[PDB]
Design a protein around this ligand. Sequence first.
Ligand SMILES: CCCCCCCCCCCCCC(=O)O
Ligand SMILES: CCCCCCCCCCCCCC(=O)O
Length: 219
Amino acid sequence: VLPVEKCNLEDSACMTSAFQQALPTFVAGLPDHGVEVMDVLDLDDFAFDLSGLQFTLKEGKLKGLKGAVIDNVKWDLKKKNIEVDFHLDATVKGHYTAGGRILILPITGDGQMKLKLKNIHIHLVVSYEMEKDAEGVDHVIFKKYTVTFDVKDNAQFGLTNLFNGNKELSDTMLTFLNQNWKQVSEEFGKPVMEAAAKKIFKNIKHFLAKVPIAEIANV
Ligand SMILES: CCCCCCCCCCCCCC(=O)O
Ligand SMILES: CCCCCCCCCCCCCC(=O)O
């Protein structure tokens, strides 16, 4: 399993440093807990219709979670809530399509995407409950999460076969995207975020349904 020593759950310095040190092994996958490979992370296909853009990503991938930096862990035992702050440079790949408009430009494209995220900050809030399982050990059972984000340094857009390959229009569109990267991030990033959070919350939840609380915590 995991090469990390035991914390008080509300010792938030120990928890931050334990998350830090446990990450590479966790995101390499643990098949007998619930833990897939989380770098590269396979995202479920999704679709959205937002601010006039119709957007699909198929066989989506997220690379860079191996590389993430844990900023703070705040486990709160009265609230049975956990807050997790981190950041990373990520890449998001996959087969995309594009319909309708982005902001003031019309868009059509069916090809490949490579987004590069530079210093993306995440604020993950998880609520939980303590359950006993079948064999009378308690586990931390995650229930619900909120997530917020913040691409602080930069976002770049690579999109192949825009407007059926027509250079003029593709270049114009990609220049637009790349210049207003931050508005575009705030305008369309939430369902891309949701897509990874849905998988990340799921994987953690699996882990801790499998390991006894008495096993990884101070009682
Ligand atoms: C996005 C990366 C999150 C993956 C890490 C999941 C949390 C594992 C808990 C590690 C802390 C151990 C607690 C303890 O031993 O006291
Ligand atoms: C064509 C518009 C696509 C919208 C992408 C905007 C950039 C937002 C990145 C989303 C965050 C990725 C999730 C994560 O870092 O775990």
